[PDB]
Ligand binder design. Structure first.
Ligand code: MG
Ligand code: MG
Ligand code: MG
Ligand code: MG
Ligand code: MG
Ligand code: MG
Ligand code: MG
Ligand code: MG
Ligand code: MG
Ligand code: MG
Ligand code: MG
Ligand code: MG
Ligand code: MG
Ligand code: MG
Ligand code: MG
Ligand code: MG
Ligand code: MG
Ligand code: MG
Ligand code: MG
Ligand code: MG
Ligand code: MG
Ligand code: MG
Ligand code: MG
Ligand code: MG
Ligand code: MG
Ligand code: MG
Ligand code: MG
Ligand code: MG
Ligand code: MG
Ligand code: MG
Ligand code: MG
Ligand code: MG
Ligand code: MG
Lengths: 103, 132, 49, 101, 129, 162, 311, 113
RNA sequence: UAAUCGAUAAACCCCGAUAGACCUUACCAACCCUUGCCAAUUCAGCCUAUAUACCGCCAUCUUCAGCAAACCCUAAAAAGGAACAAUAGUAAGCACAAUCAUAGCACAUAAAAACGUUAGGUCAAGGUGUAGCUUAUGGGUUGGAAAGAAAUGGGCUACAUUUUCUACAUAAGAAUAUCCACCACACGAAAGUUUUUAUGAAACUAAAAACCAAAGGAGGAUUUAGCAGUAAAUCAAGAA
């Protein structure tokens, strides 16, 4: 049984139904244990790409975009890039045909 | 002629709750707010949710507790828990009252995924502010 | 989700707990409309006859 | 039951629009770029034109969630003026008072 | 009650700025009283002030169908109190704020800003590259 | 509750309604649990948790001479099922340049480098950080920026001589 | 209803103790002043109408007075004027007239007013009519009209009240600065979105500085400089005084006017007690109540309406 | 559509149209249901010879019977509303002349006729 | 037009819309689906007919002072019911008034403003009584609509010197409808043609430049608004 209201709240909180105090709004969200350099610095994923092409212009833009993006995990940011690798690599034809040789 | 949330003058015999006797322009002057939550303050989020939520708890309490509800139902939100106060008329035999207390708290808590606290204040007859 | 609220309170009506005055009004009225001899036609029957 | 058929339609357009969000985003990125070749952009053009257009964002219409009314909704409460007023005037809406000044 | 002491050099706060938003001025008055009375007992050395009130008004039509000559207008007022505390320890802040927040009334919100004291980062102290 | 209390707007009888079944006293948030006696007791129970403030720090001069950097960090509480508030991420650095080990060349290069985030009147270099989902992360990155700016301000290069 | 008053006063005192012991004060010196603070802190209602805010008060201030039992248990009424339906009134009347008669056989602007109608209604615990009130007061004039005895004067004193009247522009004592050892006065005017503060130094070169620049440059509109000139040209001090000025909000005329008010306020330390009433009658020290009027919805300009159509 | 529905009273105002009323509050007990559950605090007393009855479901036929009971209840009420026409005639039919109005009211003084 | 509805004396006419490219959408054109959202139901679903069946929200008299139970009187009562040196009226209630808000007064404005009236408005906010539809008056996909002979309501910008331009904040410099063959210029292009850009899957939409510079030279009968920080002029913000 509950001996007091304080008892009540206490059991709620151990249980996880009440909130922790004082509040930190990031409680319960660990964000994968990632750190800032695993968000901001995107060199890792640009290693496979033509280094002097307009492709670099574009993907440096996407880089900057995803570097500034709070609403995404690392795994999603990655997925975007890999989707672009897959995309550009799927069309070799159009790369060759536009007046630039692309790898 | 404003018909908003108002109760018309009868032959003068009609019983009226303090709330239903105080017209919309009176909110925050004499009458208070039936609900309380953070959501409508300047910098705040998710006001809408607490509104849907509130509405559904009005209908829910009116339906779970038939014929025994006295005055409109007073919701408070405090630090993720709901405190639902009700003025309830005495009709039911007390067993049934506690059955429905447990029933409500549990059911709601698992619906809104946050802990609910319920309070029944029992009253012999509807309070009469005017006429009668 | 509207289906959630609607269906949940619906079952909770027949489990005897919830009480819907609106659907009860609906009900009683529908009963009194079928009673006088106008109901809702068995699908496919109404027109061609 | 959602209150109207119009609502069903728009519920579905919300679910669609959440579904394809990233296809849209990704494809449109190339499409909106002056740095890329035009050749890429034409094909990509055909590509966003390809994906179901009930899944496009602008095809979404905020409604009053209770009452379904397509216009008159106040963004913050996702409510029609009539419903909003109705609530606020029993006092069921917190912190809203009839304004004098 | 269980207290533990860990060796690590607890965080200092130069200024702890606590804003309470509200609707009713009364609630914020009594809450000020409570906060100041809690702080006076915990030796916290605090000040309080009243920032300018915000009033947001907007307009709806007065009828269901058509009289656009006729409108209703609604308000929401947002009233402020700020408790500004000086020279707090880490734990001091954690407890005091815990006591504050736990007792926060239902009509009000609270916005905390801490300004934390850190000497210098390690790679900058006096190395140069 | 022992205390007789009448609230409500009166009828022309002149009687503010009684304390029983009074809806509008049931609306009022009550500070009852918070009656000053209770506070005194509470705070004496909390005294055990609170830890002492260092003596010398009484004056801002000593703070600055000892601790140069302020890290501004905000946190919000609003009632509802989610404790998620987006606004919390944001971190600020205030750092006084005069407290820094800078070369003449290094200082001037850092000013031009940083731009608006430097206040030339108050010497307060500010850094706001947003970009990352978690507060700790923004802290790390703001520290990173500080570090970097200092390391880069001392490095002379060709175009500098141009 | 008297049993209610007994009960209520008892419970009021019991709840009084109960209040003191929780609020932690000596139950003895507890006042209404303390009662208020107490409830106000316990049940904090933001509400505009102040009667609908929580109250614990002595039932006598809470409840209306009652008309006592008017007849014995035999049915027989106590007062002989009972059948008049207003005994309370006509008793005052009988007595008043009696006083008058005795005065006639015997005889051979302090801020004092007669009661309002509401105050006689409170004094007799009786609803009244205007005519009735008027009749009575008329009678009291008849009373004052004759030689005034001792009990005669006491009698009319019952129905006497006294009212305050206060007119002076509040005079700030000057302030002598420590730096030059010199006296200054600092005024604050406020007009129409624009506040100004003006420090006036008693020994001037005629220098007048505004927000850190000269007044000619800050008011290129001549009209404004005239407005500024008004108080000083009034008090003939034009060269004598040296003013520093800080003004913010609104547009130029509003600013010049705010400075007018602030200056004319800071000029009443260095003026004579007599010139003050002049500056009042010149209207220098009185604020301008005039401000913008809010547009009204369904209209144009708060006054201007959408063009109205007869057809 | 649960959101769309309303309170009973409102529905009867907007049914009746005064600018006869039957009540649905009559006959239904708490926990009463068509899916036929017996809830420990409502349908059934909280305890039997043995304590703390569990959550139980009646038969098909027990429910057919309780439903028959509510049906016959409604029939009973309708008959009771129709039987409500009875009168004593004063002179002729709808003429109120000569109709007994019933003894006058007791005055203030306790005087009774 | 193959192609919505509603409002339409005062009390319609930038009105429901604080808002239609697709969507919204109710419309027309073709195609398609029949326990066809839900836990269960000879059941769903209907922007189909009733606003002269209604609840809701309002308009209107109206910044008008009255409405109304409970009684009492009138050589009878359909109804009426006051005179203050008073002649039959008393009465709690709801209105007005009073207090609240516009951060202190005061005034001003805001709000409020019953009972009824106009069978005033709205079954397209939603909900309902009565009626109808049920392999369709239901539900989906794809396109398509919103053209001007006019006639009129309200706005915007003008018709210029109290003006126009540039600088600029409120002392400046130039332009200035007639010379005359200007290499046209004075006001006035919000309109169009062209090019961009914003949004968007889709420009038919908005903005900006370049061009072009038209009617207009202060307006018939008749009319609208405003009593002070108002009218008039000027600028900025928000709702969606
Ligand atoms: Mg009106
Ligand atoms: Mg849209
Ligand atoms: Mg104007
Ligand atoms: Mg007959
Ligand atoms: Mg029509
Ligand atoms: Mg019509
Ligand atoms: Mg009309
Ligand atoms: Mg108009
Ligand atoms: Mg369309
Ligand atoms: Mg249809
Ligand atoms: Mg018709
Ligand atoms: Mg009508
Ligand atoms: Mg109606
Ligand atoms: Mg009157
Ligand atoms: Mg009469
Ligand atoms: Mg006031
Ligand atoms: Mg007034
Ligand atoms: Mg008005
Ligand atoms: Mg009034
Ligand atoms: Mg009609
Ligand atoms: Mg008409
Ligand atoms: Mg309908
Ligand atoms: Mg129906
Ligand atoms: Mg179809
Ligand atoms: Mg279509
Ligand atoms: Mg014309
Ligand atoms: Mg004009
Ligand atoms: Mg000039
Ligand atoms: Mg143009
Ligand atoms: Mg031209
Ligand atoms: Mg011309
Ligand atoms: Mg005329
Ligand atoms: Mg918006």
């Amino acid at each position: 049984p509950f001996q007091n209201g304080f008892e009540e709240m206490i059991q709620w909180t151990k249980e996880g139904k009440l909130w922790e105090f004082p509040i930190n709004n990031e409680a319960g969200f660990d964000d994968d244990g990632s750190e800032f350099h695993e968000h901001i610095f995107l060199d890792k994923y640009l290693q496979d790409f033509p280094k002097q092409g307009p492709i670099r212009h574009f993907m440096e833009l996407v880089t900057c975009g995803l570097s500034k993006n709070p609403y995404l995990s690392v795994k999603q940011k990655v997925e975007h890039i890999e989707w672009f690798r897959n995309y550009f690599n799927e069309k070799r034809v159009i790369l060759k045909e536009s007046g630039i040789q692309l790898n | 002629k404003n018909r908003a949330a108002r109760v018309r003058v009868s032959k003068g015999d009609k019983p009226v709750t303090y709330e239903e006797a105080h017209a919309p322009h009176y909110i925050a002057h004499r009458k208070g707010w039936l609900s309380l939550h953070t959501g409508n303050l300047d910098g705040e989020d998710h006001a809408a949710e607490r509104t849907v939520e509130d509405v559904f708890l009005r209908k829910f309490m009116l339906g779970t507790f038939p014929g025994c509800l006295a005055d409109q139902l007073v919701l408070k939100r405090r630090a993720n828990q709901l405190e639902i106060c009700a003025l309830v008329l005495r009709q039911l035999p007390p067993h049934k009252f506690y059955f429905l207390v447990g029933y409500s708290e549990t059911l709601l808590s698992h619906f809104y995924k946050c802990p609910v606290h319920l309070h029944l204040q029992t009253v012999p007859s509807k309070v009469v502010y005017k006429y009668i | 989700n509207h289906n959630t609220y609607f269906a949940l309170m619906g079952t909770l009506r027949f489990l005897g707990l919830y009480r819907d005055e609106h659907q009860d009004f609906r009900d009683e009225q529908l009963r009194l409309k079928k009673l006088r001899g106008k109901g809702k036609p068995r699908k496919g029957e109404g027109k061609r006859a | 039951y959602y209150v109207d058929w119009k609502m069903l339609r728009d519920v579905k357009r919300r679910k669609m629009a959440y579904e394809y969000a990233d296809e849209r985003l990704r494809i449109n990125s190339l499409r909106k770029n002056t740095i890329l070749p035009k050749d890429l952009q034409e094909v990509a053009d055909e590509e966003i034109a390809s994906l179901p257009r009930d899944s496009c964002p602008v095809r979404i219409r905020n409604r009053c969630v209770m009452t379904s009314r397509p216009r008159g909704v106040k963004r913050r409460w996702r409510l029609s003026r009539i419903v909003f007023r109705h609530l606020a005037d029993h006092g069921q809406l917190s912190g809203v008072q009839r304004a004098m000044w | 009650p269980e207290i533990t002491i860990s060796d690590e050099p607890d965080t200092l706060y130069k200024r702890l700025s606590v804003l309470v938003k509200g609707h009713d001025k009364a609630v914020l008055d009594s809450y000020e009283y409570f906060a100041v009375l809690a702080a006076k007992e915990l030796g916290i050395s605090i000040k309080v002030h009243e920032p300018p009130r915000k009033i947001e008004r907007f307009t709806l039509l007065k009828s269901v169908h058509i009289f656009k000559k006729h409108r209703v207008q609604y308000e929401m007022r947002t009233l402020y109190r700020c408790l500004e505390l000086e020279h707090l320890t880490g734990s001091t802040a954690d407890v005091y704020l815990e006591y504050i927040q736990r007792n926060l009334p239902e009509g009000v919100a609270m916005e905390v800003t801490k300004t934390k004291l850190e000497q210098l980062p390690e790679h900058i102290r006096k190395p140069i590259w | 509750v022992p205390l007789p209390v009448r609230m409500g707007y009166p009828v022309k009888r002149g009687v503010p309604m009684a304390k029983e079944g009074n809806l509008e006293l049931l609306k009022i948030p009550n500070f009852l649990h918070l009656t000053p006696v209770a506070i005194k007791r509470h705070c004496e129970a909390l005294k055990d948790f609170c830890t002492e403030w260092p003596a010398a720090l009484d004056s801002d001069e000593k703070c600055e001479k000892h601790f140069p950097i302020e890290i501004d960090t905000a946190d919000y509480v609003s009632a509802g099922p989610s404790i998620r508030n987006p606004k919390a991420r944001v971190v600020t650095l205030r750092v006084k340049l005069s407290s820094l080990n800078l070369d003449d060349h290094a200082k001037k290069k850092l000013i031009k480098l940083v731009g608006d985030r430097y206040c030339k009147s108050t010497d307060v270099l500010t850094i706001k950080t947003d970009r990352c989902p978690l507060k700790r992360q923004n802290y790390d990155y703001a520290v990173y920026l500080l570090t970097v700016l200092y390391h880069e301000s001392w490095k002379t290069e060709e175009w500098e001589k141009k | 209803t008297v049993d209610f008053i007994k009960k209520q006063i008892e419970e009021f005192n019991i709840g009084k103790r109960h209040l003191a012991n929780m609020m932690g004060e000596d139950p003895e010196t507890f006042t209404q002043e303390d009662i208020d603070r107490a409830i106000a802190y316990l049940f904090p209602s933001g509400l505009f109408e102040k009667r609908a805010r929580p109250i614990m008060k002595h039932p006598e201030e809470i409840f209306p007075k009652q008309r006592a039992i008017q007849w014995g248990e035999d049915g027989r009424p106590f007062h002989f004027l009972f059948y008049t339906g207003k005994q309370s009134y006509y008793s005052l009347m009988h007595d008043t007239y009696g006083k008058l008669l005795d005065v006639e056989k015997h005889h051979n602007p302090i801020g004092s007013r007669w009661l309002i109608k509401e105050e006689l209604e409170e004094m007799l615990v009786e609803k009244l009519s205007d005519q009735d009130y008027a009749q009575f007061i008329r009678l009291l004039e008849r009373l004052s009209a004759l030689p005034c005895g001792a009990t005669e004067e006491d009698f009319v004193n019952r129905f006497r009240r006294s009212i305050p009247x206060x007119x002076x522009x509040x005079x700030x004592x000057x302030x002598x600065x420590x730096x030059x050892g010199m006296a200054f006065s600092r005024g604050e005017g406020k007009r129409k979105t624009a506040k100004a503060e003006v420090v006036v130094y008693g020994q001037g070169s005629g220098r007048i500085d505004v927000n850190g620049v000269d007044y000619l440059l800050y008011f290129p509109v001549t009209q404004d400089r005239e407005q500024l000139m008004f108080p000083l040209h009034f008090l003939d001090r034009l060269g004598k005084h040296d003013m520093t000025c800080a003004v913010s909000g609104g547009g130029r005329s509003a600013q010049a006017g705010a400075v007018r008010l602030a200056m004319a306020r800071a000029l009443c330390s260095f003026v004579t007690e007599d010139e003050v009433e002049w500056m009042r009658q010149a209207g220098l020290l009185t604020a301008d109540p005039r401000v913008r009027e809010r547009k009204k919805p369904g209209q144009e300009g708060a006054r201007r309406k959408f063009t109205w159509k007869k057809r | 559509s649960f959101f769309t529905k309303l309170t009973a009273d409102e529905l009867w105002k907007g049914a009746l149209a005064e600018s006869r009323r039957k009540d649905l509050n009559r006959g239904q007990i708490i926990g009463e249901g068509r899916h036929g559950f017996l809830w420990p605090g409502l349908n059934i007393p909280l305890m039997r010879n043995g304590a703390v009855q569990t959550i139980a479901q009646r038969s098909k036929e027990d429910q057919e019977k309780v439903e028959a009971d509510m049906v016959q209840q409604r029939e009973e009420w309708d008959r009771r509303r129709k039987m409500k026409v009875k009168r004593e005639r004063g002179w002729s039919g709808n003429t109120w002349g000569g109709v007994s109005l019933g003894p006058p009211d007791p005055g203030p003084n306790g005087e009774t006729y």
